[PDB]
Symmetry: D3
Subunit: 246 residues, 6 copies
């Protein structure tokens, strides 16, 4: 049963005809998401790529972690595509950069500011990191049905957690010129949030005939602090959206 | 004679509370679009900017031409915004670059490849030239209501009609390095079409808290020919406007 | 009948014309043509209004470009297809140097490429430079008319507002790229802002076409962000006389 | 747990100032076990961290995950906790015809085909390794007699198009990377990997020392996908000994 | 201080009120240019910067070598500007890229393709590497007066002699992607020629209120060969030198 | 007759030399040559003065580059054509770290590419990195004579003035790109400014040639803009050459 793909350790058989994947960043969240669906089965775990299969309305669905960042995301998406996935719904965590966005709010990304590198490996910068219309629609309509506080708009997608998101509470306390004042700039432009995979995901899918949607739960409000203290709606929405896209 | 803006020749009062504008490229289309709504009145014509007011479900609507290209578009949108317009629906013509997108088809742009310069005057290239979700939804729903062969997706928005759209039917018959082989590249990336205002419109709106939608009627298929030779799309943009008031 | 997609013109319409005067504003076309011999209207489609007239026995086209490089690129390309080899732009402009007064005439040697369309003809490193003969004719024409004239670099912007660092706008913001840009151009001795020359000059200089660029100063940005609507016409009259006189020297 | 991702405290490091940073979390324990007193510290996301002792000194082994972004998190958070020297041990695809599978490649500097490096320094800044770290790696390689090459590495944000792999879903490579492998080959670039540009750039621009070593798992002149290299691991540990 | 500037070894006094400098690349050409004017005298020589002073129309004129390339050019121009030079006329050698621009032809540059780095230290790439109108006019008129097959237009100004000018007869025989096919591109765009200082010179002057002109003698046609023939260089050089001096006369 | 267009040198002039020491200043060429056996003048053309000498029975070239990447690229290329495979630059430099003093010796591992010529050999993403053997030899040579030596990154600029953020100039202006740049490089641990290494290191590293870079500090920029290791750095480069033959 040699793997069809280099990193994921999966064969087409493992998908059982699945064409949709829910793709969290954290491998540890994969089982948790899969458990919200019928007949969840662990498939594989290699590096940051943990994969489970489950069933939604009688149809197989994949849950597969991407790890943090465009590079590992690009591997997961490519290899899932090779295996037969055609629709990707990213479920992530995010830092809000608008003052009235609450922790736990669900942010649906229409398109992303490409503060990444991997997107450029699929399309030049001019190309929009835009989500699929059907996927975005499914997410918004799912959000409506469950009644979660939801915001829809543009997301800044960064290759770093720290300087690219203009965090200063760091070892160096320095932010390179490019990102000095960048958060205020994005804020003024109505950008809702920061995360770290959507630019890559959306660009690589939109430029390769794959459908992608992007949703995230807010874990910190950056107008207040750089790092949240210790302590669902977005996940409920991503699963419900997947239902609509089968 | 009075105008609250430098180019359009319009006062805020002329808008009669309008918060939505339909923005075709061609000044000659303005009257045609206005005619589909109630109480159409000509407001002004200056340079490439012809404006009419009309009424849709008891609400004032502006129709104002942008002229061809990001620069004149940026002026029209900015000045309309100064006057109170918050939702912009572009209705254009377009060249399809996908083999199965036919002349007469209606194309709704989710976001644009920024092959323009004006978008960069509002946001750096990294920023997506993305349409407003509500506007795009309204356009897709309007397309269903009117009836059209409709495609939804990415559009290449060029500062030129010729080399930036890799046309060779030109004086020089050549295309700068940047654009050599570019059409086939966009085609491979699933880009539907070329037009000349959406990157500017979508970027300037998305980065300034304005809502923008983008729809165009296909007048040529570029896999077949370079030189082309809009009622469906106009009905759709008007129907979309009705949903966004 | 049209040989070209946008302009609605045929080679027959040019009557052997090899020079075009290209204002941004369609309304100015008739005005420019009125300074020449037996002007006649040819066509009006979108922002492209065209007239033909004569200057000492030679046919000359006057054709508007509309605002911005994109529509300019269409007009110039299609005129080139029709046989035009020399283009003189006559524009309006905002001066950014303190002692360039309203009504002054500015002749552009080359432009700061703050546009996108120029890039569709040549990479950024290529100069948006005017043709030597055209620039010479404009400078000489300025002396013939007797206008206060400055010759030098022009910033050619794809926007009227943020690219010219105007702040009295809907957003009241200017993107990082253009924050402080006006002061920078000022310090570099850039004379003025307008919106078509970068495209015009680049597309011509990279395609064997001759181009010149002249504009009348309708505002000085070191005293006003807003152009005075009533003083614009007389101010532009000098520059219009100059572009026509320059054309006379290039035939 | 106090650093946001790694879940580590300063105390967990017990004074460690050097970290060995593999890409794969599953390799962390394996590397730690080659040294004295290996102890698991934490595992969160792709970040598995162990402590060990080398010649009496505390050392950290911590995975970066694949790519600059996760690397940048691990390096930053380790630096917050006192790590000043980072030795990446990776896998790599060789692009020079005479560089064989099992060969050890020591990177002097990287071609920045990533995005995260730009979050620390503009492109003009060199993704250069620390001289002492590179020296230790080279001398460690010489000590065990491993077939070793020293030079430039192309560090890519993708495994596929950025390394001009065509055996993919789309079979497409974006214009930027079309013909890129041959160009790097002609420029004497030894190999592709996916973290060094970020690692080297972020360290070189922040007063941190970084070294980069990788074991060759495929030669790209032969095939795109590696057949499903303890020399490289031996070398990184021995190099670490010289850097304490 | 026996020098008011760091590299050139000159004081303001040495200029004797000169406001115009002729700036060849080759230190060896400095005396040759000076010798065509009145009261020529050596000033200084440090590194690639050899300076002479002469007189035209009773006005002092500097001749100062720049060395090859934008970097050394930027030093010479800056330090001369500090000393009071406001007008710079470069006289250079050049490779023609157009088929009908021939060895021995004289080329006057209106503006340059910025294939250099130093220009970017004065203005962003969007800014035109454009010559001064009065200077260009004087060079064109000068070329017409003394006799010369003259072309006026755009020049590609490269930081390298080899790959940036798409020369393949080199150690590596390779040309980086950016410059592969570049000569044909410039040719199609009507670019006349390659040289190595004008982008820096023109940009730094046009963006700092200084006047610059650029003239060069064609020593090779690149549609024919990569390396210039030695036989035709001396005559081409002296010919362009006569033109630059005549231009200077018109600008004083 | 010369085998190369600028240097005025033949392969025979080199007498089998495979290493060249490349100072910027033609006037320092003989001074470096005089530290080795049998120094003899080869040629002087433009900024390119070349001598040959002998080190441990092996021929060595000393050849000036002139200031800047452009002239450097000519000298390196033409020397490479004549058989040189190892290039050791010895220069002067302005220190930008407060902990570095005038007379200190700086060995460059890699350079910030603030030049243009490097781009003619490799795109910006490519590292302007020194050869490991050359760097090692320079470091070891430095340690052998006990000179105060720092090893690390160097900012290599196409200008002496604005690119090194000098304001004591005709214009007193520094273009936006370089505004605040010295502080930026300082914070990033960059040791110094000079004007040839980015070109040298990039062109060599991308063409299978070995390059090393060493410089003597003639000013510290935290103290002054304009300068007021002559022997130390020269002794080091010659001793390093010895180890690389
Ligand atoms: C808070 C936060 C979570 N996740 C991210 O990717 N970025 C952030 O800033
Ligand atoms: C046919 C066509 C119409 N409009 C455009 O903007 N581009 C095109 O190609
Ligand atoms: C005043 C003015 C006129 N025309 C322009 O293009 N820009 C300006 O600022
Ligand atoms: C084979 C291989 C392993 N790891 C990488 O990062 N790239 C490669 O090509
Ligand atoms: C022939 C020639 C002379 N001078 C240059 O700068 N480049 C060339 O190609
Ligand atoms: C002082 C100094 C020497 N050499 C340089 O190249 N730059 C400098 O600033």
């Amino acid at each position: 049963s040699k793997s069809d793909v280099f990193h994921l350790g999966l064969t087409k058989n493992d998908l059982q005809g699945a064409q949709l994947a829910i793709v969290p960043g954290d491998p540890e969240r994969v089982e948790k998401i899969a458990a919200l669906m019928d007949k969840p089965v662990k498939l594989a775990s290699h590096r940051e790529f943990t994969s489970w299969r489950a069933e939604l309305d009688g149809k197989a669905v994949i849950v597969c972690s991407t790890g943090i960042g465009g590079p590992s995301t690009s591997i997961a998406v490519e290899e899932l595509a090779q295996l037969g996935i055609r629709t990707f719904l990213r479920i992530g965590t995010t830092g809000a950069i608008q003052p009235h966005i609450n922790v736990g709010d669900v942010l649906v990304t229409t398109a992303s500011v490409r503060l990444d590198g991997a997107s450029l490996h699929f399309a030049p910068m001019e190309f929009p990191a835009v989500a699929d219309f059907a996927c975005t629609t499914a997410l918004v309509e799912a959000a409506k049905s469950i009644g979660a506080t939801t915001h829809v708009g543009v997301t800044a997608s960064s290759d770093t957690f720290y300087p690219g998101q203009e965090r200063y509470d760091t070892y160096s306390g320095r932010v390179v010129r490019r990102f000095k004042g960048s958060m205020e700039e994005w804020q003024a432009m109505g950008v809702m949030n920061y995360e770290m995979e959507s630019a890559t995901l959306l660009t690589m899918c939109a430029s390769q005939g794959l459908r992608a949607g992007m949703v995230a739960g807010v874990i910190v409000n950056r107008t207040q602090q750089e790092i949240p203290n210790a302590e669902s709606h977005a996940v409920k929405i991503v699963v419900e959206a997947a239902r609509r896209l089968l």
